Design a protein around this ligand. Structure first.
Ligand SMILES: Cc1cc2nc3c(=O)[nH]c(=O)nc-3n(C[C@H](O)[C@H](O)[C@H](O)COP(=O)(O)O)c2cc1C
Ligand SMILES: Cc1cc2nc3c(=O)[nH]c(=O)nc-3n(C[C@H](O)[C@H](O)[C@H](O)COP(=O)(O)O)c2cc1C
Lengths: 200, 200
């Protein structure tokens, strides 16, 4: 099966979510050596804001698109196709300014596509991604899960994933990382324990 | 006083939030002809993703910055300064894929600045923007305020605004816009009634 490994942290080697997302993927490869991994670093190679141009490009026939429109259309196509092909997705999801990074939301905007990851039916919208397994690697400076301050982060992500039909979701969490070295170390240690004994 | 008018819709003349944000500002000008308006269309002139480069530029002395770093630093400075100067802010805030547009969040990332719009104290973080009035123009295809599906939209915005100390907040809402022409028309009519009789 195909595993898509997504990072969105802007903090590079100092990133908690990049460390933990890599650790989930390493654990996964060890548990299933046949897994095929595709990597996408949404911070290193940022996806353009979903724009009026994105919409115009989508509604313009390929043979009449200019270069900028071909760019937007290919960006939309390649991102969507990579997600559709994936059987499992590991997503690094920092909390920056009370929500996810715009680098991550820009990816979400390309994968939330009517007719592909969800569809409209006479009975209402139906998610089409129910076969996909997702591991969300959720990292934050504070501890606000289950509280209003956390609305834009895990709650939002759960809404999006639920809408496209994901039912098989695990959250690997390391929160309170800004409260000092000992608290940061334990939060990461606990997340590693989840990876080691509660994922596979 | 200085009013900052922000739009983030990608739908141009078909935008509900651009129509209503303009109507709030027109009403404001009529109520207070001395108000000075500054406009920023975050969709037409999109702010770069808040990135590793943004952080590096901020920590690099001006005299050693290269051109790309001067760009990031000026973008950060001009956006922040415009917000600090504003006494009132009218913000067009569509719901796209269960949250705000990345164009709007990229602005939030430049205005959430320690020491400027909030500060760390020995007693915890304190918002510094309590004198500012904000009118949020909230538009959505569905009706999900007060429900989990709405977490990434108004709930998130209220968290951000509360953190930087905004207490004087009004929300002008037009939701259910995707459910048909009559429902869209009434939602906009109700929002116009709020503007006419419940804002000023
Ligand atoms: C630009 C920026 C914004 C942040 N905003 C928040 C925030 O709103 N709430 C919070 O709890 N932590 C916040 N943090 C702390 C991060 O959530 C924390 O450092 C986490 O480890 C980020 O994941 P990462 O290390 O993989 O980048 C922010 C950090 C940065 C760099
Ligand atoms: C790319 C895109 C994504 C959208 N996602 C949502 C959504 O998640 N939930 C919703 O209720 N409406 C959604 N809508 C509908 C918009 O919220 C609605 O059209 C609203 O009027 C947008 O504000 P605007 O007209 O100022 O652009 C979406 C519209 C677009 C174009």
């Amino acid at each position: 099966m195909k595993l898509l490994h997504i990072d969105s942290s802007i903090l590079g080697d100092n990133s908690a979510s990049r460390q933990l997302s890599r650790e989930v993927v390493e654990a996964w490869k060890a548990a299933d050596p046949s897994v095929e991994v595709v990597y996408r670093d949404l911070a290193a190679d940022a996806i353009a804001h979903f724009s009026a141009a994105t919409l115009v490009a989508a509604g313009t026939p390929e043979d009449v698109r200019d270069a900028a429109q071909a760019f937007e259309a290919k960006l939309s196509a390649e991102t969507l196709e990579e997600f559709l092909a994936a059987d499992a997705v590991v997503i690094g999801a920092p909390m920056y300014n009370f929500t996810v990074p715009t680098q991550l939301k820009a990816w979400i905007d390309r994968v939330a596509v009517a007719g592909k990851t969800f569809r409209y039916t006479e009975a209402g919208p139906q998610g089409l991604c129910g076969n996909k397994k997702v591991v969300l690697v959720s990292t934050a400076g504070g501890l606000h899960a289950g509280q209003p301050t956390g609305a834009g982060h895990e709650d939002f992500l759960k809404v999006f994933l639920g809408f496209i039909g994901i039912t098989d979701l695990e959250i690997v969490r390391a929160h309170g990382l800004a409260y000092g070295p000992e608290q940061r170390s334990q939060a990461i240690d606990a997340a590693q324990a989840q990876i080691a004994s509660e994922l596979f």
